[PDB]
């Protein structure tokens, strides 16, 4: 059948499943942005914007 590097080509003539795949991608990216923001907030020390700003951390 399909080699490994072509598995997603089953979406080429399936617009509803392409939209589904694209929604799942957007879900993952949005989930990344939330989880990343929360990991940063858990780690960020906001007490010294002068010698310990966000770019040092």
């Amino acid at each position: 059948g399909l080699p490994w590097y072509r598995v997603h080509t089953v979406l080429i003539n399936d617009p509803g499943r392409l939209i589904a795949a694209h929604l799942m991608h957007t879900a993952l990216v949005a989930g990344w942005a939330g989880s990343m923001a929360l990991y940063e907030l858990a780690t960020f020390d906001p007490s010294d914007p002068v010698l310990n700003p966000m770019w040092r951390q």
């Binding site: 906001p46 007490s47 010294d48 010698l51």
Partner: protein, 122 residues
């Protein structure tokens, strides 16, 4: 017109110091030979400020505002003691007894709880 416990209970008014009408801009003559007394001193804190600790030695060590987290438990009330007229007509208040402390916890920006024993003991 003067409230009872059933009017006061649960309203938060029990944590308030009593007030005076705006008309009371008077003066209380202290006779320098009489003995006076404080029958009730009430302190109602409205603001708690906490000094920050800059790790620098320097910087502006400013008092920052905090949020109270231990609710309307903050006032000192029913404090009594002698008010001794001195030689020079200065009055000194010597605290004797009353509800003269309250543990208070405030919280700073970031979530640091700061407990303090808010007091006027002795």
């Amino acid at each position: 017109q003067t409230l009872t416990y059933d009017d006061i209970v649960g309203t938060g008014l029990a944590n308030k110091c009593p007030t005076l009408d705006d008309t009371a801009r008077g003066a209380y003559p202290i006779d320098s030979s009489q003995t006076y007394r404080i029958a009730r001193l009430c302190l109602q804190p409205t603001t708690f400020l906490v000094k920050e600790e800059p790790k620098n030695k320097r910087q502006e060590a400013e008092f920052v505002p905090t949020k109270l987290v231990t609710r309307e438990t903050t006032s000192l009330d029913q404090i009594q003691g002698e008010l001794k007229v001195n030689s020079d007509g200065s009055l000194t208040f010597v605290e004797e007894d009353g509800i003269d402390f309250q543990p208070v916890t405030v919280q700073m920006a970031g979530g640091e709880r700061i407990p303090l024993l808010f007091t006027v003991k002795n």
